[PDB]
Amino acid sequence: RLVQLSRHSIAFPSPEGALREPNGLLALGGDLSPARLLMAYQRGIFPWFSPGDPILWWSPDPRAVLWPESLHISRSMKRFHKRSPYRVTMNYAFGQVIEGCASDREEGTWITRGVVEAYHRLHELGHAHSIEVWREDELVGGMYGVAQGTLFCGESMFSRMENASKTALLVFCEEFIGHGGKLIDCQVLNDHTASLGACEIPRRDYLNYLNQMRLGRLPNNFWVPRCLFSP
Amino acid sequence: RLVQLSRHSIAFPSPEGALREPNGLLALGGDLSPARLLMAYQRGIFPWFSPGDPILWWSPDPRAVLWPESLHISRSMKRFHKRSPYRVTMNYAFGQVIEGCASDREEGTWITRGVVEAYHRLHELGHAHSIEVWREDELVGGMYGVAQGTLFCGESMFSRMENASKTALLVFCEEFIGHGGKLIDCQVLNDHTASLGACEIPRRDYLNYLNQMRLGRLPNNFWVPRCLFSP
Ligand SMILES: Nc1ncnc2c1ncn2[C@@H]1O[C@H](CO)[C@@H](OC(=O)[C@@H](N)Cc2ccccc2)[C@H]1O
Ligand SMILES: Nc1ncnc2c1ncn2[C@@H]1O[C@H](CO)[C@@H](OC(=O)[C@@H](N)Cc2ccccc2)[C@H]1O
Secondary structure, X not given: OOEEEOOOOOOOOOHHHOOOOOOOEEEEEOOOOHHHHHXXXXXXXXXXXXXXXXXXXXXXXXXXXXXXXXXXXXXXXXXXXXXXOOEEEEOOOXXXXXXXXXXXXXXXXXXXXXXXXXXXHHHHHOOEEEEEEEEOOEEEEEEEEEEEOOEEEEEEEEEOOOOHHHHXXXXXXXXXXXXXXXXXEEEOOOHHHHOOOEEEEOHHHHHHHHHHHOOOOOOHHHHOOEEEEOO | OOOEEOOOOOOOOOHHHOOEXXXXXXXXXXXXXXXXXXXXXXXXXXXXXXXXXXXXXXXXXXXXXXXXXXXXXXXXXXXXXXXXXXEEEEOOOHHXXXXXXXXXXXXXXXXXXXXXXXXXXXXXXXXXXXXEEEEOOEEEEEEEEEEEOOEEEEEEEEEOOOOHHHHHHHHHHHHHHHOOOOEEEEEOOOHHHHHXXXXXXXXXXXXXXXXXXXXOOOOOOOOOOEEEEOO
């Protein structure tokens, strides 16, 4: 029952109508305007499409997700992290992180210049945030996403140095949990997310979770740029 | 006799010693740091000055105020709001609302890059909030201010489409009242504000209200970003 968004309205169809195959494809067209996106993440919808294609909106079923508590950290990583060679900051360099994500010529191929601006825009308005991983003064990895109350919608992550990506995710989760963070939406499950504790749950439930958590809150300063981890 | 603020501390002089004409002129100098700004609102003072001049602080007598309940709404406006073409949201795009007021070419000329950054910190820190009015996908109005308990200090409004500004206030007041909102600071009274039902109580009366409402509280999640009204 695919819907064709217009320049006019900013309203999305109901997730229930999403197609089974491809999984969750709900609507195409529209723009990546703050109001539109912010409206979409609020309803459990998210944009994803390959360069050259029109904007595609999804709300897959089942929905991959990560319980902060359940993050799985190997014994080796913990040893590594006990004596971590990195530093971790919050919203210190959103632009660089989303850039490194597009860099990786794979999962980040969809992150096009326009995609980068739409999200940078959210970060600038206080909704899209990033976790940066440093080695010296160099940014070696990180991750960004869109906060939805006590729920965090992961957008992507990148790594240019062994375990940088896990450090960011690791430390994020700790800060997140210690302050009220309830969930992490991973959208679609994959080997990486799976090897981390991401698990599927019915769309029907993710929407319940979403509706509840989007009205919750963390300390005011929680998303204020700062240092999260440093030896 | 007209105190100069010192960078050393965040202390302000009694408002009762403000000038009688220019009405409210109390002190100049200081800075626009969170600590200071918050202290000003805490004690019934607010900064205002045109580009070029030093920081000027005020606390006029009388003070313009708006009883959330006594908001005057014409019959054509209700007629219009019933079939409203706008969408109202809270703290979705503080940055843009403030820039919108800051560019209303007439009054918002005092809102400089400096002032914007200053209030943006308070928003980032969670004391400043904004009400956006959307027409489809575009921002056509809004309003921002500083939350002082059950009291709310209005800083500015801006409109790009008929009745946008009024919708913002309308929707706000309803919500505001709904959860314990008690008063809306209007700083100085003017034609528009007065047509909306704002009045004037003595500086000392307003100051009392300030103390009572400062401690007064609203639901813990009152300001979290969210839609307040769908067309
Ligand atoms: N098809 C697709 N849709 C969205 N995001 C995608 C896609 N393909 C790759 N990505 C991004 O690349 C990373 C690779 O790890 C993906 O990570 C995820 O599984 C995210 N959907 C959720 C998440 C992001 C950051 C941190 C934790 C979870 C994805 O972001
Ligand atoms: N001197 C002065 N101080 C503040 N704001 C001023 C001033 N002169 C003009 N303005 C702006 O013009 C509008 C006129 O309606 C003012 O709006 C206000 O009522 C604000 N002062 C307070 C307020 C903000 C939002 C919602 C309700 C009240 C102001 O923007």
